[PDB]
């Protein structure tokens, strides 16, 4: 093309403003660009990945640099529980003198406090001085440059990888599993043993003395001799003060279980052992596929041979090998799905099994991290289903996958969708019904008539791991259980202490109130899934539009006929599911925050009793904890929470603005724009200036996207302010 | 002194840079190669 969308003649030859809008949003769909060959596609994608990696490293470099140049890491290291971590400095020419003072509280210059947890992580991993952080930043800047060079290099004529190289699954998997994940873990345990653990005990091991400071007194003698037990002897005493030698030990690899008494975090020795074990597992697993050395498995054969003899699963997995290798969308979907689960797990396990020192005592940071990863997880999950649908519309070959496990899924689509619908209905009616019953009776002044179910099943699981409050004498909660006998001399001692300590988030106590919220979360997952799954299955066709596959993943509609076909494309399913995703994640995050807020405040009872009905959430959570935020700036002054206060209102604006695009549709606006064109052409003086791109209204799908973005941005921003200002304003 | 950098770079990054970038994009999208 000769216009902006060089990759699309259709858009390029467009006489309106759409040319600009669409060109920007269709830029990264390399597969649909004019004149795209598969080889070029893969090559360009590979190079683009190098660029993304570089951006990630530049981002990390910046955090280190700004903390080192404008932060208080060293002071924090000295007094971790009495210093507020600094992120970066503030230079806003719009600030008033008062603001300069407010944001400069506790320091000598206006500054922003970090709620990212970097200080704790770096403290745990070994960083003790600002100069060290600087070196890291410089190194990452260099690595970023190297990655950029690689992107250019592999796009050059003699270094462009072949399409075959891009499809050698065995070699990549072997290498990625054994080297990227396995050896990297081994390297990490090396760092922990050589640098981190020594630092925790007061010894400095850096690039200056690492080659002459043995990690363990015995040496590598025990390792090669086979007497590995030596490395687990003399674990740090329970009276050990972190970052000092008082009460220190010599152990480097142990399975103590539990948390360091003073830092209330997992033992470093245990983490080292953890990564060492994981390393061996992955390195071994990376020797499973054939890679030009004779031995190994061929993935195609494995998939083809797996067909249940009964025939209940049809022809089995035959045909899937080719489908996956020849479809980038399916690959992306599988990846996003797994990463989404991982992100949720990080959030869930990181607040219970605190990994970093003094992180549990920083309430605001702990709250931010959870909400951060949970939201990212939602986006990652939705994307997986989205690309799954794109696959069906674009890359699915009905003939190749004949009676395959995948095809049969599309044969009982109605069954799946219908049953998922029933589940959603059941959960919805009863969950809401029970909440309303509890609200009404309480309102009428009769709280004794509430329907409160104890979460017995969950309580049982907690007891099974050792919790004793519930009084369920089972498994690890039983002294006579075979399980207890097994680990009583291994890891249970430490675990049974933490699990039965009320001041830890390991298996928090649950009650009737938790039962209901969990069932609400269930509703969210099921309903969000219904929308996404339906979109995927009904993406290649439906009774209303039996030829949907010929129109694509995203199209405005199919006309006002046959009853009306608005929002009938698969893209619209993503659009609709996004709202539900936000709602469910919101419920999850609200639950975590309120529960923890009450615990931190010392009144766990408030949640226990007020969480049973809806008014409690509104009055004892949203209304009560909004007081610090809404008073960031008042008719009498301002404080450091002013920025957070302003953002809260800003979020509401964006959210509501989104509604305009969602409820108002194109026809109205197009007609109005026409009148404006008339005016400009008929008004003297302004007539001198004219447009080169005809002014037109936004398209149907465009408006949907714009609206969803406005809704989403406002949603996240408003909650971000609340979770931070409320927690910090009250406990910090 | 490095301390003066915040007051010398921020004006440029938030005002001069964005302007020139937007101008270039306009010229790029309004040109008919």
């Amino acid at each position: 093309a000769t216009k902006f969308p060089k990759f699309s003649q259709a858009l390029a030859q467009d006489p309106a403003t759409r040319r600009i809008w669409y060109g920007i949003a269709t830029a990264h769909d390399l597969e649909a660009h004019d004149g795209m060959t598969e080889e070029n596609l893969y090559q360009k994608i590979f190079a683009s990945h190098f660029g993304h990696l570089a951006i990630i490293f530049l981002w990390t470099s910046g955090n280190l640099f700004h903390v080192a140049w404008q932060g208080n890491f060293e002071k924090w290291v000295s007094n971790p529980l009495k210093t507020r971590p600094i992120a970066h400095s503030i230079w806003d020419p719009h600030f008033g003198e008062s603001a300069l003072k407010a944001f400069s509280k506790g320091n000598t210059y206006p500054v922003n406090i970090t709620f990212s947890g970097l200080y704790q992580w770096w403290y745990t991993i070994g960083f003790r001085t600002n100069q060290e952080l600087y070196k890291g930043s410089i190194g990452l800047l260099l690595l970023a440059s190297v990655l950029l060079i690689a992107g250019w290099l592999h796009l050059q004529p003699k270094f462009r990888p072949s399409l075959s190289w891009f499809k050698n699954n065995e070699s990549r998997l072997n290498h990625h599993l054994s080297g990227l994940l396995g050896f990297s873990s081994l390297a990490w345990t090396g760092h922990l043993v050589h640098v981190a653990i020594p630092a925790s005990r007061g010894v400095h091991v850096g690039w200056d003395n690492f080659l002459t400071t043995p990690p363990h007194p015995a040496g590598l003698t025990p390792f090669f001799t086979g007497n590995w037990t030596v490395y687990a002897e003399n674990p740090d005493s329970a009276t050990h003060v972190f970052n000092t030698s008082e009460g220190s030990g010599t152990a480097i690899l142990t399975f103590l279980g539990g948390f360091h008494p003073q830092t209330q975090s997992l033992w470093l020795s245990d983490m080292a052992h953890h990564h060492l074990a994981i390393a061996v597992v992955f390195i071994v697993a990376g020797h499973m596929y054939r890679t030009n050395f004779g031995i190994g498995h061929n993935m195609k054969e494995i998939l083809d041979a797996h067909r249940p003899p009964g025939g209940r699963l049809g022809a089995g997995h035959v045909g899937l090998f080719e489908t996956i290798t020849n479809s980038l969308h399916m690959q992306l979907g599988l990846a996003l799905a797994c990463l989404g689960v991982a992100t949720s797990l990080t959030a869930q396990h990181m607040y219970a099994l605190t990994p970093y020192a003094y992180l549990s005592k920083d309430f605001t940071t702990e709250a931010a991290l959870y909400t951060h990863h949970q939201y990212i997880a939602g986006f990652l999950m939705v994307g997986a289903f989205a690309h799954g649908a794109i696959f069906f519309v674009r890359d699915y070959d009905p003939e190749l996958n004949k009676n395959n496990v995948l095809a049969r899924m599309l044969e009982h689509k109605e069954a799946i969708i219908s049953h998922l619908s029933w589940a959603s209905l059941f959960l919805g009616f009863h969950t809401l019904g029970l909440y309303i019953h509890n609200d009404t009776v309480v309102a009428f002044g009769q709280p004794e008539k509430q329907i409160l179910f104890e979460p017995l099943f969950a309580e049982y699981i907690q007891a099974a791991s050792g919790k004793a409050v519930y009084q369920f004498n089972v498994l690890l909660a039983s002294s006579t259980s075979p399980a207890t006998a097994a680990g009583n001399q291994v890891w249970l001692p430490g675990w049974l202490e933490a699990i039965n300590n009320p001041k830890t988030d390991l298996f928090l106590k649950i009650g009737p109130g938790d039962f209901l919220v969990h069932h609400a979360i269930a509703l969210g997952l099921h309903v969000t899934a219904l929308i996404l799954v339906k979109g995927a299955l009904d993406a290649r066709g439906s009774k209303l539009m039996p030829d949907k596959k010929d129109f694509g993943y995203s199209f405005p509609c199919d006309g006002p006929g046959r009853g009306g076909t608005c929002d009938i494309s698969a893209w619209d399913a993503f659009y609709l599911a996004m709202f539900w995703m936000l709602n469910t994640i919101g419920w999850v995050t609200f639950y975590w925050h309120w529960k923890h807020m009450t615990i931190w405040g010392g009144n766990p009872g408030q949640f226990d009793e007020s969480s049973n009905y809806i008014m409690g959430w509104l009055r004892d959570y949203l209304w009560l904890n909004s007081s610090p935020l809404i008073n960031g700036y008042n008719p009498f002054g301002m404080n450091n929470l002013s920025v957070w206060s302003w953002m809260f209102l800003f979020g509401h604006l964006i959210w509501a603005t989104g509604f305009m695009f969602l409820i108002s549709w194109r026809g109205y606006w197009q007609e109005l724009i026409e009148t404006l064109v008339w005016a400009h052409e008929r008004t003297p003086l302004a007539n001198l200036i004219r447009w080169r791109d005809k002014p037109v209204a936004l398209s149907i799908v465009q408006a949907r996207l714009v609206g969803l973005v406005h809704f989403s941005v406002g949603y996240i921003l408003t909650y971000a302010a609340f979770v931070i200002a409320s927690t910090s304003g009250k406990f910090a | 002194a490095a301390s003066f950098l915040p007051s010398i770079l921020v004006p440029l990054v938030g005002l001069i840079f964005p302007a020139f970038s937007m101008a270039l994009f306009f010229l790029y999208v309004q040109t008919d190669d």
Binding site: G51, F65, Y134, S137, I138, L141, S145 | -
Partner: peptide
């Protein structure tokens, strides 16, 4: 304390990244 020289060195490194970034972008174009 990060010295001025250290800060200036960092800035020089960033510049290299920038010039190498423009090229990658223009090569992908």
């Amino acid at each position: 304390m990060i010295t001025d020289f250290q800060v200036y060195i960092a800035l020089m490194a960033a510049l290299l990244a920038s010039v190498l970034a423009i090229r990658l972008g223009a090569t992908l174009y």
